[PDB]
Amino acid sequence: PDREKALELAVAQIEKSYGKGSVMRLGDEARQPISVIPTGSIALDVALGIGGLPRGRVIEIYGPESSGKTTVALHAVANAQAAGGVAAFIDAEHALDPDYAKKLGVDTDSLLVSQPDTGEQALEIADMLIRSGALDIVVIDSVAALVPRAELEGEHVGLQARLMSQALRKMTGALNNSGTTAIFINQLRGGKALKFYASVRMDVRRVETLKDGTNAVGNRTRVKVVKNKCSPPFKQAEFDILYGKGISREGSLIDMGVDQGLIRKSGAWFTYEGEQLGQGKENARNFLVENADVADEIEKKIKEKLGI
């Protein structure tokens, strides 16, 4: 007790001097904010502690080419919009499939999109939009492609990382005031700065291909929250990304349903509330999309349990 008070004291000071979430026990509960941006997977939302991505903060989603990181970012955009928010996409990759985006739920027609000339222009344009205070979310695709005017014009050579540092300093201010979430997408082969400014960092991988007899359906995706200033870090989540359709909300609800024991098994059968969802995972998955009311109740109960 003599020790516990001096430690609590120490933490309180640390917290007051450097920010809430500057230290925490990994077992601690998450302090729930007013609103967050759901990710598209409840499993990830849970892994994230606060039921989704935080507002007013920088976020980094990284992984190899074709890992699903864009898909996660696109789902963030869809939810933000679905709650009546405005969204922006700073595109230096020129890779966006809007039909795909549309099928996830993105209102593409009303999605702001910029295809910048340079790295600095991209980040300036980003800041300018953020300072409006009219945006809920902005996605920057991508870090690697934020090439500096000088490099794009002719001719020292370490300045791209310096451009990101400078830009993030400014942006972080604007983001905090505005309540806008910035997502940076990033490859593996200016991340040195982003790594520290980011309140959340998500490591995304493809784990394995999905079945459909002899032809596939998609990829089981794994995400580790390697950095989280809003809740205990180092948590991970797994969910399914189905080609042309995105994250299986339904499949994620089942997985977490059984994880929490709200959903039970009678062998291959999935029980809920004493009634059967389906035999095998895909019928359960299909049953939930055809029956939205019960899918929302499963989600309802999952959040009630975890306080998400």
Curated annotation (Swiss-Prot):
PROSITE patterns: INTEIN_C_TER (PS50818), INTEIN_ENDONUCLEASE (PS50819), INTEIN_N_TER (PS50817), RECA_1 (PS00321), RECA_2 (PS50162), RECA_3 (PS50163). Belongs to the RecA family. This protein undergoes a protein self splicing that involves a post-translational excision of the intervening region (intein) followed by peptide ligation. Disulfide bonds: none annotated. The gene is recA. It holds the Pfam family RecA. This is Protein RecA. It is found in: Cytoplasm. It comes from Mycobacterium tuberculosis (strain CDC 1551 / Oshkosh). PANTHER family: MITOCHONDRIAL DNA REPAIR PROTEIN RECA HOMOLOG-RELATED (PTHR45900:SF1), RECA (PTHR45900). It comes from the Bacteria. Can catalyze the hydrolysis of ATP in the presence of single-stranded DNA, the ATP-dependent uptake of single-stranded DNA by duplex DNA, and the ATP-dependent hybridization of homologous single-stranded DNAs. It interacts with LexA causing its activation and leading to its autocatalytic cleavage. Signal peptide: none annotated. InterPro entries: AAA+_ATPase (IPR003593), DNA_recomb/repair_RecA (IPR013765), DNA_recomb/repair_RecA_CS (IPR020584), Hint_dom_C (IPR003586), Hint_dom_N (IPR003587), Hint_dom_sf (IPR036844), Homing_endonucl (IPR027434), INTEIN (IPR006142). ATP binds at G63, P64, E65, S66, S67, G68, K69, T70.
